[PDB]
Structure formats: C-alpha cells, structure tokens
Design a protein around this ligand. Structure first.
Ligand SMILES: CC(=O)N[C@H]1[C@@H](OP(=O)(O)OP(=O)(O)OC[C@H]2O[C@@H](n3ccc(=O)[nH]c3=O)[C@H](O)[C@@H]2O)O[C@H](CO)[C@@H](O)[C@@H]1O
Ligand SMILES: CC(=O)N[C@H]1[C@@H](OP(=O)(O)OP(=O)(O)OC[C@H]2O[C@@H](n3ccc(=O)[nH]c3=O)[C@H](O)[C@@H]2O)O[C@H](CO)[C@@H](O)[C@@H]1O
Lengths: 490, 485
C-alpha cells in the first residue's frame, strides 16, 4: 500500500482532486494527508452524499402522553421518589453531548469549559459534575447506601484531548475517574454541490462532527451499550452541554418516565414566540418526532389553538430519557434508517491556486444526523413539560451577536433562579443601609444591577434545603452559599 | 430680602442657604418650590414606610386580538373612522431622563441601529403620518392626529430642537404640542431637601403620573376640547414596536363603551419587570413590578398560565371627559411611590460626593393610578412579538431590553410580514432561506429587514411589493421603493 494504490482508490471514487497539491507538500504534510485519506471510506461517503442530494401533516402529541411539572404538581413527589430510588439502586447513568465545535462564541475551546461569569466562576462542566455528586449524596441519605451515576461524555475529533486534560486537571470535580467515560463521535467531510470532498488546506480535508445523532454509531464504535449493560444501567439521561440550568439526572423526569413505562421521553418547555429556535415535539401519521426549528414553515410555527397558545408549543430542550434495551435496538438495528439533515454552508477552502478563501456564497453542504430522530422507533414515548425559568437558559451565541441565548442571559437566568430560591425559603435581600429590596429590582440608573446570588448544587439541587440558612434573615448581594458556608462578597 | 429665608425657616429647609455667603439661579429655582406641599408629600409618602386583596382580571372586561380575531376588522374600522373624523389624539410620555443608556440626550432620539438609522421619535411620527394617510384614502378627507408630547426640564429644549431640525418629520408644527411636567427634589430620609450643588437643588421629574398636573398647568385638556378630540392614546416612548394611535385598540375601547382601557401582553416569566393589571376591592389598578411579592408573581391558574398575567405595556386609552374629571377632581388622590436612591450631593464644607449607600428618596406619581376612577375599564391583550420590545438598558448591562434586542425585534417582525405577504428570502446562490435560520458560525446573522411605517403600519399593503418575489437581505422597503443593501 503506497501513494499509487491510494490514488487509484480515490480516482475510482471520483475524489482524485484530494491529491492535487501532493507534489507541493512538505514531506511531513504528505505523511499527514496520506494517513487521513487512508482512514476514510470513500464508497460510504459517496453513498451518503447521493442520499443527501436525493433526500434534498403535523399534529400535537395526545394529552395522554404528556406530563407537566406544573399541572401535575400532585404527582411530583411520587415521581421524584421513583427517580431517587432508581439512582440509589445504581440503575441510572447520564450521557452528555459535547461533540459540538464551531467558534460562534469566539473562543477555541469546548463550550463545557466556558465561564459564563457566575459569582463562583464555575464552568458548565463543573456545575454539571456537582449536580451529579449532589444526587449521589441525596439518594444515599434517603435510602442509606452509597450509589453511582456514571457519566458518559461524547466528544468529537476536535475536543477529546482538551476535554480529557481539563477533567484530569480538575481531578474530575470530585467524581471518580473510573465513573466518567469519554468516547468520540465520527466526523464527515464537507462536500461541494458537485459531490467532491473539500480540502480546507493543501494537506487537510475539511471535516466536522457528524451531528449529535452521530451518537449512535459512536456508541457502537466504542462498545458503550455493552459498558452500560455491564454496569447494570436501565435508564440513560441524554442532555446538551450548553444549558447552565440543566437538571442533570433529574429524578422527577426520570421517575415520570419510569412510572409511565416509557422506553423514550423528551423534556420540553412551552414555546411562546413563533420564531424561537427550538425544535417542536409532535406526531405525523401516529409516529412521534421532533420537527427542527430550521425545517418548520412560518405558517405552522405561528398557528394558534383555541386557548390562545401556539398549536405547536412543546419546545425541545434536548434533554431525553432512553432505556438501555431501546438504545441497544437503535444501535444494532435502527441506526441505518436515520437520515442525514443537510445544510448549505460557506466552507473555508484552498483554491486551485493554492490560496485560502472565505467564500462569499455557500459552496457546499454539511451532513448531520439528529439525536431525536430515534423517537419514531420507541415502543412507548412520553413528553414531560417543565418551566423554562427553572430549567432552560442555553448558551448559543456571543454577546456581540443577536442579543439572546448568550453568556449574559445565561448567568442572569441562573442568578435570578437562585435569588428566587432564597426568597421562597424565607430569606430576603437588603441594600447597604439594610432596607429590604423588592423581588423585582427597579433598574433606573447606570449603576443599578440585579441581585447576584449563587447556590452550589452541593447545597441545593433545585431549591430545597435552604431554610436553615436563610429563613427570616437578610443578605447583602452578591450572596454565595456553598460547602464552605454563607458568603457575602464585596 | 429675608422673605424666602423665613419661608425656608418655617419649612425647616433653611439649610438650603448654607452656601449662600460663598446666587441668581439658586434663587429662581428655590422660589418655584412649594415647601409646605413638599413636607406634606414627604410625610405621607414616607408614612408607615394589597397583594392579599389582588384579584385577577375577569374575563368580562378582557378582549384579545388573538382569541377575538373575528372582531378585529370591525374594531379596526371603528378606530380608523374615528381617526378620519379628527376625534383621535396621542399623548407621548417623554419626560423621563436618566443616565442608564449612557447618553446625554432623551430616549426618543436614540438610534438602535436599524438599517435606516431612524430614531424612536421618527418611527413614531411616521406611524402617525401613515394612519392619517390610510384614513384619508378610506374615507376621502384629510385628517389630523395631534401629538401631545410631555417633556421634563431635562428634555424640553433638546426635544424641540430635534423636531425643528427634522422639520417635524413631515407632520405640521401646529399639530405637535410640547408641554413640561413638574419636578420634585430628592430628600434625605429625615425629610431634608438635598442640594446637588452649593447653588443647585437635586431635582427630578415627578413621575409619569405628573402628567395630570402638567395637563392643568398648560391647559392641555382645553386644547383637546377645542380640537374636538374624544379619544386619547397615551404611550411610553421606549418601545420600538409601539402601534401609535392603534385603530384596533381604539376601536375596541370605543365599541365597548369604555372611558379607560389598558393594552397588555401575556406575562409568562414571574420576574419580568412589567406592572400587572388587576382588581383590588372592586376597582382596577396596576400593581407595579417593584411592589409585587414573589409569591403573588409566581402564582399559577389551573390552565398553567400565571394567575396575574396581564402585563402592562404602558399603552392606555382615556376619553377626554375622563381626563377632564381626573385633572379637575381626582388628581389630588394620587399617591407618591417612593424609591431609595444614591443621590450625588454637596454636603457641609462644600464637599462634593457620590454616595456609597443610599442617602435619600425620590417620589413619583404613576400614570395608571387613575384607572381606579374609571366608569368602565377594559383590557386588550396583544402579542408581544407584534407590539412590545422596550429599550430600558444599555448593551453592557443585564442582557435584556437593550438596543440589540430592540433592533432585532423590529427586523424579525418585518421579516415575518414579508413572508406572510408571500415574499421569500434567498441566499447568495438563490436558494430559499428557512423562516428560522440556523445560526452556527461566527458570521451567521438573522435576516435583516426593515419596512417604513409609510409603506406598512402592521403588515398590510405589501402584496405588490413582495408577493411571489425573492430578496437578498438586508432588505429595506420605503417611500423610495425596495432596496437590497
Ligand atoms: C439537533 C438538536 O439536538 N437540536 C436541538 C438543539 O439545537 P441546536 O441548534 O443547538 O443543535 P446542535 O446540534 O448544534 O447542538 C445540540 C447539542 O449537540 C451537541 N452536538 C452537536 C453536533 C455534533 O456533531 N455533536 C454534538 O455533540 C452540542 O455539543 C450540543 O450539546 O438544542 C435546542 C435547544 O437549545 C433544541 O430545541 C433543538 O431541537
Ligand atoms: C409607572 C409606569 O408607567 N410603569 C410601567 C413602565 O415602567 P418603567 O419602570 O420601565 O418605566 P418608567 O416609569 O421609568 O417610564 C415609563 C414612561 O414614562 C416616562 N416618564 C417617566 C418618569 C417621568 O417622570 N416622566 C415620564 O415622562 C418615560 O419617558 C417612559 O416613556 O413601563 C413598563 C413596560 O415597559 C410597564 O410594565 C410598567 O408598569
């Protein structure tokens, strides 16, 4: 096997242009490109592209399959108890989707390492770790035994190394290294409209992660489902890394799904603005699915039911519940049926002249599978609705962009929530003279700021357990309550 | 000589002349303050330093643009007819002034960064011009919607200058009426008027409820009657989406026989800073966002919505006879709302300081505190994406209601109007773009679109401009036609 054999393989697949700069490359760059091309399956790539080019009504879910933290408040205690019981029996794991890479936030590292500016400065990864540690601790107190919630973390080619080092450096935030399982998802090449793979540099193919639905081939590639079975796990909480409010391994959502006998569940918040970028959960021809926000028509998005609400209001917050036997079937049977969603994009490339170009017009497509496309195969699907102020504030954009879902909105949503937890547990906030501040601040002058408050997950998972700390007392913000006590910063 | 000196003495405000022997303007201002009244206001306001009695808005007084869509045409027709008969005026509350946005001019002059660069004042003026034009086409006669603008001592001059410079944006000078609202001094917790400068008293506008005394001082109500106006649409200057003189809301109040109406949007987040309309002891009130308890704000009804979900967007309907009664009879009943403040001051020893802790309070009357006197009050609910995106904070602050959110809310709305009228947006290759874009890369931006009010007031009248056509954003549609930037 040499360059001659590779040239023939590429030419038979219509990709010989991938070696066009070979004679101009430094020897080290030829070694690199040769290795990369050798690891690609050009036949499969050609097939994916063909389907993508070829592949180039909705009804709300029935009320019988939808549960609501707000309208079904009378059942929360029973669901929470069932969820904590499962966690205590070591039957629950969580799986974090952290393979996304893109630079829209303007930084080079993965989003889980981002510091949105909380008083504690904790990154998303650390806040998530502390919620998992908190539940292991709470379950042990209500049942007596120690328990474990394994943390599977999916990374991509451009995040595996950095994510691993970050964790190593932080001593896995207090969890045991043997209970954090990193695995990488696959990558796919950008392709021009004509079917040719795009070179980003003279010696580098333009590659990107294969979508969060690439989760299923990644699980098969690293025998993850076998690992789950061997650990004796029944339930998997799959979730998105970018939401500072995510209730990792939420016992209420998990208990609800277990009690309903579901093999698949989706957590949602009410969509109220027609153009909000969230996919909507629904069914077509009796089969459940999510219609992504970029695939819905304005007429559909704006449609209203008789009560005044949007007809399609179950907004996907990328928090799902899957049982292990369902994932096993997905991985060994259904995966090939998941289709690639295609996006036209401006892909930086090197031109036939050897210069690096930033296209003024889309020059190719990106193919990706979506994690929620397996809902259609579930034997029993349920939906669980929660309030967005308690559970959903995503980090998608930089502050300098469109004005929403950015670090500023994220830190303020967490601080407003924790400020409410204190008020609800009987505490109050005061100004410098000790006069009581209102629940909603008058922000009238340039120096006025909202109340800054942050409670560590170790202290409170969702608002419980604060009365002994704050009932009948008043605090000067910024207020932090953590394992080292109560702290008023200056 | 010691005439004012004795005046201050009886009021216990003699300290205001502590830097006198160290003198003209400090006299002109000092002699325009009713010290007797100010002590009375302070005592009552500070006195003793409602939630349990709050009841939700009943369905009988609430109309909805969404739920009552079948009646919109009739309401819209009634409002346009009124406008055509010269029976409608608007009143802008533009006396507010603060350092929050970090600029030295009034909010009406703010340019939030739209493709046209228009200021809030200009957009509002064009919506007025637009309804005069539409009413003339439908009924045949030229008509007038007078524009009363309330300013404060810190906005009056700048405002007039700006309008003069812009030739009143196309409206006639005689139909734009400026008037100033009164002012109030900051006071220490012990009731002592605070001096900002050894020669200047710390002063601020007396709240938007200061509107009623302002109307009396300048005989504004008489002007309205002289013009034959029946309906007045009162509105806040900071909302880029405000439907000035909205025929639907005006038509709804007229048809319901109301003398007072409040437009609202559904409040869905318990801590959103909007006052909530409610009923207390049989009469309507707005409980301001800074006066509600968290328990009440968070309460939910059986259908899952907030129990107090009628969010005030500071857009009110008042009949002229009601305002007359308020100005001449009820006004004295309005109470002052208090807020502690860090007031920059010049204490003894001519020392100028910036308080590290609040050092006094400011008093304000609120415009909606007259709802309780209405003979027939109504509430009209609209969608926030069509009607409410306020400018309250600078971009560098808390992350909401800033120039960025305001410009994006107007452009998203106009982008929707184009789609709903049959137009399409395309990328550089001519492929059609989705209604909701995937924003994944550093350079991805939502569709920029801006339609001048002179072309479309609320999404109508666009068929001949965009139906079955494709456009490359930024797209601007104005009196000069369609422009692709
Ligand atoms: C496809 C999908 O899930 N869409 C949901 C996602 O949209 P959104 O537009 O965020 O979709 P993305 O696929 O980019 O990202 C979602 C998550 O998937 C991860 N990721 C993405 C690509 C990849 O190859 N590998 C990978 O692991 C990201 O790290 C993130 O954790 O969140 C929204 C809520 O905020 C939901 O309303 C959308 O329905
Ligand atoms: C008292 C009042 O109206 N509160 C409403 C105002 O609150 P908010 O606190 O946001 O607003 P402000 O009272 O400061 O200002 C409202 C309007 O009144 C004007 N103004 C203010 C003070 C003054 O002395 N003179 C004056 O003319 C401002 O120029 C602005 O046009 O808008 C919100 C919607 O965004 C509503 O939910 C609040 O219930």
């Amino acid at each position: 096997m040499n360059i001659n054999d590779l040239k023939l393989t590429l030419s038979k697949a219509g990709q010989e242009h991938l070696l066009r700069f070979w004679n101009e490359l430094e020897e080290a760059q030829q070694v690199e490109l040769y290795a990369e091309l050798q690891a690609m399956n050009f036949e499969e790539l050609n097939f994916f592209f063909q389907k993508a080019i070829e592949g180039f009504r909705m009804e709300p879910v029935p009320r019988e399959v939808l549960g609501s933290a707000t309208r079904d408040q009378d059942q929360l205690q029973a669901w929470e108890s069932e969820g904590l019981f499962q966690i205590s029996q070591n039957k629950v794991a969580v799986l974090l989707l952290a393979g996304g890479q893109g630079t829209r936030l303007g930084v080079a590292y993965p989003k889980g390492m981002y510091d949105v500016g909380l008083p504690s400065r904790k990154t998303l990864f650390q806040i998530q770790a502390e919620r998992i540690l908190k539940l292991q601790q709470v379950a042990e107190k209500y049942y007596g035994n120690k328990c474990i919630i394994p943390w599977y973390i999916m990374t991509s080619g451009r995040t595996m190394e950095s994510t691993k080092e970050f964790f190593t450096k932080h001593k896995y935030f207090g969890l045991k290294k043997e209970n954090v399982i990193f695995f990488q998802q696959g990558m796919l090449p950008a392709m021009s409209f004509d079917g040719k793979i795009i070179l980003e540099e003279k010696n580098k193919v333009s590659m990107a992660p294969d979508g969060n639905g690439g989760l299923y081939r990644a699980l098969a590639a690293q025998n993850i489902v076998e690992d789950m079975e061997q650990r004796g796990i029944w339930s998997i909480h799959v979730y998105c890394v970018d939401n500072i409010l995510v209730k990792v391994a939420d016992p209420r959502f998990i208990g609800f799904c277990i009690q309903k006998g579901a093999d698949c569940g989706a957590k949602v918040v009410e969509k109220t603005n027609p153009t909000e970028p969230v996919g909507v959960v629904c069914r077509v021809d009796g089969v459940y699915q999510v219609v992504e926000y970029s695939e819905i028509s304005l007429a559909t998005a704006q449609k209203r039911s008789s009560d005044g609400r949007l007809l399609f209001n179950a907004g996907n917050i990328a928090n799902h519940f899957f049982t292990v036997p369902f994932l096993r079937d997905v991985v060994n049977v259904y995966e090939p049926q998941l289709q690639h969603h295609v996006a036209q994009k401006k892909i930086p490339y090197v031109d036939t002249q050897g210069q690096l170009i930033k296209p003024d017009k889309p020059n190719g497509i990106k193919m990706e599978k979506f994690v929620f496309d397996i809902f259609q195969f579930a034997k029993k699907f349920v939906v669980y609705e929660v309030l967005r102020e308690d559970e959903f504030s995503p980090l998608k954009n930089a502050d300098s962009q469109n004005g929403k879902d950015n670090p500023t909105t994220a830190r303020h949503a967490l601080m407003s929530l924790h400020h409410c937890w204190v008020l609800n547990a009987g505490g109050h906030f005061i100004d410098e003279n000790g006069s009581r501040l209102p629940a909603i601040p008058r922000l009238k002058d340039a120096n006025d700021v909202p109340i800054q408050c942050e409670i560590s997950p170790l202290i409170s998972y969702a608002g419980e357990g604060l009365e002994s700390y704050v009932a009948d007392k008043e605090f000067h913000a910024p207020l932090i309550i953590d394992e080292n006590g109560v702290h008023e910063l200056v």
